[PDB]
Each structure stands twice: as C-alpha cells, then as structure tokens.
Design an enzyme around this catalytic site. Structure first.
Site, mmCIF file in Angstrom:
data_model
loop_
_atom_site.group_PDB
_atom_site.id
_atom_site.type_symbol
_atom_site.label_atom_id
_atom_site.label_comp_id
_atom_site.label_asym_id
_atom_site.label_seq_id
_atom_site.Cartn_x
_atom_site.Cartn_y
_atom_site.Cartn_z
ATOM 1 N N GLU A 1 36.857 37.727 28.440
ATOM 2 C CA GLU A 1 36.498 36.618 27.542
ATOM 3 C C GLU A 1 35.739 35.553 28.327
ATOM 4 O O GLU A 1 34.823 34.917 27.811
ATOM 5 C CB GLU A 1 37.727 35.913 26.942
ATOM 6 C CG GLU A 1 38.987 36.716 26.772
ATOM 7 C CD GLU A 1 39.771 36.880 28.058
ATOM 8 O OE1 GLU A 1 39.404 37.759 28.854
ATOM 9 O OE2 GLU A 1 40.750 36.132 28.272
ATOM 10 N N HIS B 1 39.686 39.261 32.776
ATOM 11 C CA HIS B 1 39.574 38.436 31.581
ATOM 12 C C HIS B 1 38.112 38.528 31.143
ATOM 13 O O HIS B 1 37.287 37.698 31.530
ATOM 14 C CB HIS B 1 39.892 36.974 31.896
ATOM 15 C CG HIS B 1 41.352 36.654 31.897
ATOM 16 N ND1 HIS B 1 42.101 36.601 30.742
ATOM 17 C CD2 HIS B 1 42.197 36.353 32.912
ATOM 18 C CE1 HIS B 1 43.346 36.279 31.044
ATOM 19 N NE2 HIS B 1 43.431 36.123 32.354
ATOM 20 N N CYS C 1 44.306 41.703 30.625
ATOM 21 C CA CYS C 1 45.143 41.442 31.789
ATOM 22 C C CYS C 1 46.599 41.850 31.523
ATOM 23 O O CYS C 1 46.938 43.023 31.641
ATOM 24 C CB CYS C 1 45.063 39.971 32.189
ATOM 25 S SG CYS C 1 45.692 39.687 33.853
HETATM 26 N N1 LIG Z 1 47.137 35.936 32.837
HETATM 27 C C1 LIG Z 1 47.660 37.147 32.884
HETATM 28 O O1 LIG Z 1 47.378 38.014 32.048
HETATM 29 C C2 LIG Z 1 48.657 37.368 34.016
HETATM 30 C C3 LIG Z 1 49.423 38.738 33.983
HETATM 31 C C4 LIG Z 1 50.455 38.826 35.149
HETATM 32 N N2 LIG Z 1 51.160 37.690 35.247
HETATM 33 C C5 LIG Z 1 49.741 39.031 36.473
HETATM 34 O O2 LIG Z 1 49.864 38.176 37.428
HETATM 35 O O3 LIG Z 1 49.020 40.060 36.618
#
Ligand SMILES: NC(=O)CC[C@H](N)C(=O)O
Ligand SMILES: NC(=O)CC[C@H](N)C(=O)O
Ligand SMILES: NC(=O)CC[C@H](N)C(=O)O
Lengths: 531, 531, 531
Positions: free
Chosen positions: A507, A505, A377
């Site tokens: 994970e 994500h 992310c």
């Molecule tokens: N949890 C994250 O990796 C957020 C990344 C960034 N804040 C977004 O909104 O994309």
C-alpha cells in the site's frame, strides 16, 4: 534558474487539512512539469515516528529508505508521484539533537549556542540539503502545529529567514485558516483569520496567499474584506471548502486560480497544467461503473490510511467503487453473517496477540469458501499459520510473536544464519516473483521492490513441508546487504480464485496514478466473485 | 455592603449569544433576591440607536424613558424583570461626545485630554452613575464587540481599572469564547479560546470565569485543560451549549454551578435561587397542552424580536404553543390561501408606504371573516384606515405618511393644537382604558402605561364619525407634559370575537413572568377561534 | 504623476525627536524641488490646542489661518519653509467629533457607524483633503503617540489602508525607535526595536525604513542585525544620533542616504538635493564670528520655542551667537545685576497679572539705560504701560487685563466701535508700516502680514496723548473683515538705539532661511550695544 520555496502555515485550529493542501499544491506544480518535493515539519520532539504505535493512533508511513515518518509523507508521495525520504520529515527532536550533539563535540568552536541562529541554521540547512539531493526546482514546506503555539516558533523563524537568504521572487508564504460558517446566521466569521494573520505578522511573516477553510466556499465579497485587512491582495485569497473526494482538491484550487497565482508570485512563466488524470479519477469516483464490498478483518478497526488509499486506487483502475466493511478481528463469532455480502476479505498488518486467532478464522473461512483473500504483512503470516494448522496438520502452529513456545514456529525472528541483529526489515527490499504464479500475473515483472516494516519471517525450516501440503511460494527475496537471503516474500494458493499474501506493505507504494498490482488484482477478483 | 461588578467579554467570534448569557446571569442573581442591573456597552460610534432603521436590520428597543437602544436591553428587561433606561446602553459616540464637548467648554482646565484617563474616566463614571440611580447591589456589564478588535479597547481598559478602584472581592471578570466541535473527529478545538484569553491578558485582564460556547457541552477533561492553560480554576470553566429554548440557559448555567461560583467569587453568602418560574416556563415550552397558528402580516418578514417574545410569553400563560406564519404584506394575492390554517392575524409596526395596502387587505379580511386581529402601532393605523374606507365609506382614506394628499387624513401628524414639535411620542405614556371594553377585560385596570415610538396619530376630526360607523375607542391618553391630550390609544370592534389595536408597542413591556394582556387575549382568542 | 505618502511612526518611548525627523525629511524633499507638506497627527482628544495654556506647558503654535496647533507645526513650517494650516494638525477630537456630528444628522443613512471604516475613513479623507488644497506632490504624515498605545490605533489603521488605496510605489512607512546604548558595556540594545516593530507588524504595518535613535550612531554591523530581524533591508536602516544643533539633522540623514533611499522607495528619479543653506547655517552655528547676550524677562522662564528659534535665525544672519539669559519677570530686585553683561532685553508674550509689574521694570530700565528692547505682544503692551506711567505721567496706567479698574486703561479689550465679539485676533493681519521709522528700516516694506493671538489692544483714546509724550506708532492695521480698523500694531522710541514693540508674534513666521526683521534688528542693535 533559482530554486523556489513555498511555505505553508496553518492558523486558528490544528486540523484544517493542511496536509492535503500541501499535497494538492504539489500536484498542481508537478502537473506543470516542475521537479518538486515537499517537506513536512513536525514540531514534536520525537526524533522520528519510530517509537510510536505503528497503527493505533494513526498509520506511520515508511519511505523507500526505511524511514518511519508521519502519515503526511504518504499523502505527499501519492499526490506528487515520487518517493520521499527521511529528510522530508523534519522534527524538533532531530534539529535540537544534531545541534546539541554538535556543541558537545565542540564543533561550534567555544561559542554560546542558541535557538537563533544555531537551531534555526540547522532547520534551514536540512531543508536545503534534502531539496538539493532531490534536485527540486520548487520545494513546498509545510509547517506542522498551529501559528501561535510554542513548538513551531523555531521553525516559523527559520522559514521567515529564507526570504532574505534566497533573494526576491524566490519565496512565497501561504497561510491556511478556519473561517467558521453559521448555518443559521448564514455568515462567515473572519475574525479568527484576522487574529491569526496578525499573530503570524507579529512573529515576522507576511503571508502572500491565504486559503480559507470552511464548510462551503467563501464568497468573493467576504474574501475581499479578508484581503484588505490582512495585507494580502484580493486575487490571492482562496477557499478550501469541504468536499466528497480528496482528489477534488487539486482541481478546485486550480480552478479558483491558486496555480496561476503561485507561478506568478514566484515569477515563473505561465504553464498550462495537465490535470487529465485527476479529472478522470474524480469522474470515476463520482460515477463508478459498479461497486463491490470487501471486508477488512483488522485489530485496529487513520491506522490503515495507506491501505484504504490503495483500495481506492485499485477501485478507480477497475472503474468500481470499493465499499469497506470493518470486521473486528477479536470478535471473530458467526463468520457467515460477519462476511455476509462480502466479495473479498483483507487481513492487514499489526503487532501483538490481540485479534490473531480471530484473523486466523477469517483466513480459514476465506480459503475454504473460495473468497478472494489479500493478506498484508501480518496478513501473510496469518495465512501461513492457518494453512500450517489446517492443511499441513501442524497442530498449535503459530508465530513466536504470539506464542514463543509453539511446537511449530512457522513464523519466527530473522533466522540466525541469515542475520548480519534484532532490527526489523525496513524500506524497499528486492522481491523475485516466480513465473506462472498469480503474483506474476498481477505484476507482469519478475523483479520488483516493495517496502517493509516487520521483524518476523516465514521459518525456512517449514517451507519445504508447507509447499508439499500445497502452499505456493510465489516470491522470495535475494536479500540485501547480505541479510535475509532467500526469505519468503509472498504466498498464494493454486486451487483458489484469489488467495495472496505479501510480507511487505505494498500500500505504501500505491499511487492513484499507478495502483499496487496486489490490490488491483484483489479488487478484480472481488468483482469476479460478485459475479 | 460594597457594590459588586461582574464584567462579561467575548472572544474568538462576534456571535456567541453573549447577550443571553448576560441576561441569564442577571436572572440567576435576581432569583437570589439581589437588586441587579445590566449595562450593555456597544462599541459603535452611534450615540444611540435612534438614527438606525427601527426594524429592518433588527429591532431597536425602546425604554420607559423613551430611549432608543440596542435590542439587548430588551433581553435584559425580560430576564431581570425590570425597566432599564438610556444609561444602560453605553456607546463610543456617547463617551467621546461628552468628553469632547467637555474640553471645548474648557472644563478640563487647560490640560491635554486623552483616551486614558479621560475617555476611560467617562466610561467608568457612566457605569457607576446608572448603577447608583438604580440602587444596584450587583451590576452586570456586557462589553460589546470582540476582544482583539480596535473599537472595544477603551472599554476593556475602563473595566480593567474597576478591580483597583473597587477593592478586592468586589469585581469579577467573565469571558465567553467559541470552542469549535468537529462532528467527525469528535473533537473540541480549544486553541481559539487559548489565543483569545492570551490577548485579553495582554490588554491587562485576567478572566476569573470562562464560558465555552459550543454545539454541545464541553467535557470535564477538556474544560480542565482549558482551565490550566488560561490561569482559570477548573471549577470556574463552564459550558454554553446550543439549546432549543432560550429560557433553558439560566437553568443549565445554574445547574453547572455558575451561580454558586459567582456568589463565592464576589464573597457573598450562598443563597439558594428560586428558579421555579423558569423551570415551569421551560416545561410548558417543551410540552404545550395545545398549539395554535397565527399570521404576522409584516413588511419586514430580529426585526420583531420583542413581538415574538411577547407571543411566547402569552403562549406560555395560555399553556399553548404559538406557531407563526410569516405573511409578506406586499404580496397580499389570495387571502384564503395566505391565511389558510390561521387562527389569528397580527399586523405589527413599520414605517413607509411599502406593504401598507397589503396590510389593509389583511385587516379587512380579518374583520369580515371574524378572525382574531391584533394591530400594533402601525397595526392600529391600518385598521383605522381599513375601517374608514370600507365601513365609514371614506373613499381614499389613509395616513398622510403614505398619502400626504388623501382627501381623508384619518391618520396624520400630531394635531397642531395638542402640540407643544416634530418629534415622535417615545417611552411610556398613560393610557386610560374604557370600562366594559375588550381592552378593559384584558388588562383589568382603567389606567396603565405603555411604550411608544411613532409620529402619527388618529386624527381627532374623524373620531366622532368613525365611532358612529361603529368603531370603538377603548382607550385614550390624558397626554403628557401638556402634549397629545386626548389622543386615541386603542380601538376595537364590538361585533367581532377579537379585534384590537394599540398605538403603543405593548411587546416592549412584555416579560415572560408578566405577559402583555393584549397578546394574552390575542392568543386566547386564537385558541377560541381554532375551536 | 501620483501623489506620494511617507508615514512616520515612533516606538519604544514617546520622546525620540520624531517631530524634527519629520521636519528634516521634509527639508530634504523640498531641497529636491518637490512641493511637500507635513501633517502632524496628535492622538489626543482635544479638538485643537486652543483650550490649552498658550505657553506654560510648551508653546502653542498659530498658523496663518489663525489655527492654534501643536508646536510641531512650527518646526514643520521652519524646515519646509511654507505656511501650514489647521488641516495639518489632525486630532482624535476632530475625527470623532465630525463622524459623531455626521451620524446625529443622519448623514450615514441609518447604518451602524464604527471606528472601522467610518472613523478611519474620516482620518484618510482629512489627510487627502489638506494635501490636495496644498497641491502636495509628497506628503509626510507623522503619527503622534507611541506604537503600542491605545490612542494611536485608529490612526495606525487609517494610514495602513493607504498602501492599498494608493497603489504600489506610492506609499512608504518609516518607524523611529530607541536603541539604548550602555556606556560601560559599550553595547547597543536592539530588543526594544525588535519588539516595537513586531507590535507594529501585529497591527498590520511593515516599515520600509527604520531610524534608530541613540546617543551615538548605530554601527553598520548592528544595523544589519536589526535589518535582518525586522524584514527591513540593510540599506534602509539609519541612525539618528544626538547632535549639538537641530539643523545638523537634515544633513546627517542625507549623508547616510535617507534621501536617496526615500526617492527610490517612492520610485522617483534621483534628484541631487541642494543643501547649501543648511550647511552654511550649521557652519555659522559652529563658528560664530561673535557672540552677544540678551535677556528674556518672561513669566515662563518649550514655552518660547518659536521665539528662541527666531533669535537663532537672526543670530545666523548676523553671523553671531546669541546667548539667552533667563530673567524671571516676577523676581524683578536689583536690575543692575539682573541685566549685567546683557546687551539686549526682550519681553515676550503671556497672559495673567503674574510678572507684569516685573516686566514693567525691565522695560523702564531698558528705556532709560538705552538698552536694545524688543517687546512681543504682551511685550508691547508692557512698554505702552511703562511709557504711559513714567513719560506721560498717567499714574496707575495699566491694561484692564491686569487691573480692570485702572483710571487709565491704556490697554483694553477690542474697542466696541471697531468690533463686529469677545474673540481674540488670530492669524495673519495686515500691518501698514510708517515710512522713516525703525520698523520701516528693518522690514523695508510698507505693508506686511504678521500672526496674532491676543485679546487686548492699545486703547485708541490714549494714542494721541502718548504720541505727544513722545511715543511713536510705527505701524497700524487697516483691519480685517471690518474689524479692528486702525488698531496700533507697533510702537518705538525715537531717542533710543533700539526700542521696538509689536502686537503680533513675529517669531511664528521666522524661518531659518528667512529671519524675522524685528529680531534681525534686535540682534544687530544688541551687537551694536556690545560695541
Ligand atoms: N505490521 C505488521 O504487519 C507486523 C507483523 C508482525 N508483527 C511482524 O513483525 O512481522
Ligand atoms: N413603528 C410603527 O408602527 C410606526 C407607525 C407609523 N410610522 C408612525 O409613525 O406612527
Ligand atoms: N500672548 C500674549 O502676549 C498675550 C498678551 C495679552 N494677554 C493679550 O491678550 O493681548
């Protein structure tokens, strides 16, 4: 064939590993072929984990349906190997809000609404509703909080009522307590357990099974004493000793006989569980063929619970122990020493400017020094930012999250054209992988689903240029419900042993039985790098 | 000036060091010039500790009046520096027996007798009676058992009633609880304390002061949380961390402010305690000028609680650390290795043949190898037996306790002539020391009192002969109430650096502020031996 | 065939008629052919009821073996129709005294003795011992006191342990509570019941059956609510309404289904009870063919519980309602008005001079006015005294109990010759009835047993003379264990419709199914007198 309910309460103290106990019993039951589901009751007033900090005070799990829940749901998914949903995390806020909104609409037909039976009916109804939707044969319900506190009372009452509602043989109650052990006196103190069960009985619940949490297993003689003063039969008192690896728990509980005791108590025909996966996974964890070290350059160094679990899953598959070196993003300032004896660099998720520039340096260092790189992310956004600046010469490039006035918003909010408003992309989103990429090599599929929780995307307007600079878009999403059509989901570098980033994500979906390919490859590349 | 009562209860678990807390508060109050006394309530049904094993399951203390009590009385005597009596150890057996015997005699005048108010009246009456006899200004009462159990209920009720009986400002209630500390989570679990106080409140007692037992001191923020949910003011919540030396407790409690809090709560004018003795004793224990090792050849290697305390008192006075090497009597079989790096040999008390012959060997070895020797009670009888056999050539000599048919009963029951029946000599008995002896050099007095608990004496008929063989009777007793006139109380050897034995238990009178001379000399001789 | 145990506890308030409930269940079980026995646990500290006032604060029952017990034993004997003994009344004093005496004798082998398990073992052992001696198939144990108090705790714990000791299906727990009914609101308050059961559960007992005591029966809907919040199945919640006649209780409980519920819960094959006796006795009580009034000239006007029961039994047999006019002995001073509309005069037992002379007048008046007279124990002594004075002209005649210096001790302590010391005659004593007497006509036997509790006898030295004066000794005792050989047991008058006296307490043996002949005749004569 009646649906079976197994309730799990905790006593004496709030921390006993009750989440892992629930998960472990879940695994033993699935290892018997049963369709199971677990529900985590969180007595807190928050409707959901959505208004909490996503990482700082412990990770907030995200389910396939986009629900932001307590981290236990993640444990549950990993041990049961199945997707859970919003309905598997029940809170006080949810329950009181529905009942309250219902009486304001006059749906209670002018009667006086009360905790009992109205709040308690709502709780039971939600428990059954979710179990029905998931066609569960056995449902394990964990009551958060600690018996004896005020917040969990409505829930203890709710589950107590199930015995009568479900009829004999369909409900089982298990209570976990702390049994202090004096290293000197060499004695186990059972009074806390005695007082806790007495309190539970006072609210109307008689546990059928007890699990005693203690540094070491509780001796048979001691367990018998507890059995006799609690009204629980001797064969139904078990131990929960502290252990090296979490995956050992299902195994030790089954060995003592928890599985058998549970089947019998629920009046089910004995089934020999197949615990082959857990036994081998634990064997690998105790005897890794090799071990490699990777660094996590994060700004929150259980904030990365699912991340660390994902690394462990990948390690097992690679038959290697993965050692994590925590590198504080902000501190990034001698990189040579910071990443000394490091065969891989991982840049996890986060929100806020804090540590951004520090992560940027880790990425650059990982790109130039040909060191395996995995960005999750924010990790991808960082890589895109570092690449934009140092390879595409886009000076000052950044995300509008960190610099709303950057002259090159290579990362910004959801493009107005692709919008439908100011909400994040949550839950599973389809990802179309591009053939021949590193991403493709890892998954072995062209279409997959990964879970999201972010409000920033790679700015389309800059993709063309970045690709010309040498950046590869190995994945995109066809969108969902007419939103985010075309958004970049992954990036990688062609001239690098392993440089990959994803917007989702991965994970969150990683299971010890089925590791997340991005991490499997990251670990594999790390090992490679270590020669 | 009203008499003040401070009650001490315990919660969560049975072992918290509540005995030492009571003792420590006792010391802080005496350090303020108050006349104090402590009463240990032991909820067990045994009338007294007389039918229990004297050593095996922990030492049974003996008071000046000959009462056999719980070991806590010893702590109490040591910290308060005063003799206690039978009335300072209150048990369930005592209370129910008196009330029951009283109603069988019809002394309750035909009314129905009940736990409340009859059993509770008896308890309160005994508490006041003993405090009166000892002219106490402040009385500290410790309730044995754990709040929440059945046995202590009559006593909790009894002490609750004191508040109303004594009037405002004359009673204070203190409750000690366990606060588990997770080394990992780095957190203190306060729920057990919360539940325990809630249970105490349920029986009708509101603690005024709380002491939290935990590995380390409980942080102010945490203590405040506990204060607020228990109804106890913040300044009245204290810590009881685990410490190296017991003598540190009074000091740490005073420093936190327990003494001040107590004086105020009892409405007494602030008195600056003089804790000079404890501070120095603790300084000596942390920084001994030297250290010597002595061996204890016992058959029970808290069986020797008072003995070990006596050694510590002597060590402090000699400004030396005394290390104890436990030598199992029965195992005595290479003595050279068993007593290797040993500058003193102590043979303590006991009953039964087990280990007798083994002790005999230790004595012989200590007599021939000129090694400092201290024999307590059985220790003296052993020495007399070994001397009889190997110096007076009385083959087969022994005590009729171990060999009823020995041809030379150098130790036997109370001589029929000196009797008045089959009872032991208990409590203080006058001892006339002989001038010029080692015994005399140590005490510096010709007449003293020492406590006894034994049923065997040195057979008079053999004294003359043994003396001719070279044994010295450095002490005898003029008897008491026409019993035991002339009995031998001590023996020693002229041609030895330090060889002494006593029939009494001088450890029982040893106080850290006033060490027992026999032990002071033993340690001194040990140091000497070590060169 | 395992022995079955039914325990009965009470909650909310101390008075609920739990004694009659125990008795009533006892009757329903005996009506099924089972050999049953009831044990009354009295938490008070008195070893037995022997040191209490025999009448004043409620009658003290006496068993065949001479034990002085709580009045409930009498109920038990009457409803079960069987003699009970000392072992059927268990008290705190008995239990603590045996355990305490046992540890002083060292019979616990040097271990620490405690309420649990030592006091609790004693309680269970006594319960089983007495049940064994009486070859009981089903044993009903009533716990005195009220759940929630301190005194009954050791007993609640003791009986809780039976479930595990006896194995499944052999123990049943029943709890009786108060359900207040508001005549206005027209509502039953179930919270007290809810809180009481919750407290019981807290000590570790889950009731299987509940009985709700209330002015009127508790509605099914209300009973269901209680069932659901207590964990007791709906069919196991019963009512105990207030009723006119005690004998109605067994009937109403059986009708609701208590008997059936109990058999099932104990896993016994259904037996149709034969309640024919109770149904008819209740029919007679509701519809007496006639009604007569008799006066009880006593000095304690439940002091005469067994006496009044005996009258009721006799009334039923005579198919007549017996109305009792209480005449205060001492007040006896217009006898014509005092005994106006009285067809019989009864002079019951008592101790002390108070009211003696008043009773004397009642006897004289009953002898001269040819009014049926029944004298029990003191009642006989009174008659002997009045006859001695006014028929044998023995001026000042009396009992040495009231006048130690009377010149004619026609009633005195046990004759020195017939003694074996200063103890009363207690329990059953053989009585040889003389043929042709009124006593003989009533019993229809020449030899019978009646229970005693008195220390004064008819002085032998005066018998000859009194007989010459016209007094008839219709009964004597051959003595027992070489004591009291020849003592007078009964007296009567030849020229009188009905004038009888006995030294024993025949009320104690009276059973509703088998009335005491002396009372049967007294009532019969009364009816006769009424014409
Ligand atoms: N949890 C994250 O990796 C957020 C990344 C960034 N804040 C977004 O909104 O994309
Ligand atoms: N405690 C002891 O030393 C007892 C010694 C020996 N049994 C005696 O009665 O004298
Ligand atoms: N209860 C009685 O009737 C007692 C009568 C008289 N006191 C006696 O001892 O004989």
């Amino acid at each position: 064939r009646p649906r079976k309910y197994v309730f799990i309460t905790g006593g004496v103290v709030s921390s006993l590993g009750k989440g892992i106990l629930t998960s472990s019993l879940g695994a033993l039951l699935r290892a018997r072929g049963y369709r199971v589901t677990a529900i985590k009751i969180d007595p807190y007033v928050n409707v959901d984990a959505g208004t909490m900090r996503p990482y700082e005070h412990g990770e907030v799990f995200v389910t396939a349906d986009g629900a932001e829940t307590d981290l236990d749901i993640g444990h549950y998914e990993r041990f049961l190997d199945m997707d859970l949903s919003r309905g598997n995390n029940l809170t006080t806020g949810q329950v009181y809000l529905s009942v309250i909104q219902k009486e304001r609409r006059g749906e209670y037909l002018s009667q006086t609404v009360q905790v009992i039976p109205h709040i308690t009916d709502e709780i039971k109804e939600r428990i059954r509703k979710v179990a029905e939707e998931q066609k569960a044969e056995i449902v394990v319900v964990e009551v958060g909080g600690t018996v004896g506190d005020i917040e969990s009372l409505p829930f203890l009452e709710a589950i107590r009522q199930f015995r009568f509602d479900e009829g004999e043989g369909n409900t089982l109650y298990l209570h976990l307590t702390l049994v202090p052990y004096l290293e000197t006196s060499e004695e186990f103190k059972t009074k806390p357990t005695q007082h806790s069960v007495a309190t539970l009985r006072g609210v109307g619940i008689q546990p059928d099974i007890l699990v005693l949490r203690s540094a070491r297993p509780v001796p048979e003689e001691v367990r018998r004493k507890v059995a006799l003063f609690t009204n629980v039969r001797p064969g139904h008192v078990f131990s929960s000793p502290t252990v090296e690896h979490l995956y050992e728990v299902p195994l030790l509980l089954e060995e003592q006989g928890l599985g058998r005791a549970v089947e019998r108590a629920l009046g089910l025909e004995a089934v020999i569980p197949n615990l082959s996966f857990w036994q081998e996974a634990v064997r690998v964890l105790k005897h890794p063929e090799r071990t490699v070290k990777i660094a996590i350059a994060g700004k929150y160094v259980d904030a990365y619970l699912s991340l660390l679990e994902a690394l462990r899953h990948a390690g097992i598959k690679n038959r290697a122990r993965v050692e994590v070196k925590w590198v504080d993003a902000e501190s990034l300032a001698d990189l040579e020493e910071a990443f000394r004896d490091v065969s891989g660099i991982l840049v996890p998720g986060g929100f806020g400017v804090r540590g951004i520039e520090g992560k940027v340096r880790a990425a650059q260092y990982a790109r130039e020094r040909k060191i395996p790189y995995l960005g999750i992310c924010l990790g991808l956004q960082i890589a895109v930012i570092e690449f934009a600046r140092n390879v595409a010469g886009l000076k000052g490039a950044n995300s509008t999250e960190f610099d709303p006035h950057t002259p090159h918003p290579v990362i910004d909010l959801m493009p107005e054209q692709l919008e439908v408003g100011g909400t994040m992309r949550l839950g599973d989103w389809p990802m179309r992988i591009k053939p021949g990429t590193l991403l493709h090599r890892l998954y072995g599929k062209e279409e997959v689903l990964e879970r999201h929780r972010h409000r920033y995307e790679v700015n389309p307007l800059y993709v063309d240029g970045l690709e010309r600079a040498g950046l590869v878009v190995s994945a995109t999403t066809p969108g969902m419900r007419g939103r985010g059509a075309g958004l970049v989901e992954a990036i990688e570098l062609k001239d690098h042993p392993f440089f990959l980033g994803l917007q989702s994500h991965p994970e969150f979906k990683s299971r010890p039985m089925r590791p997340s390919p991005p991490f499997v490859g990251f670990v594999e590349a790390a090992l490679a790098y270590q020669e």
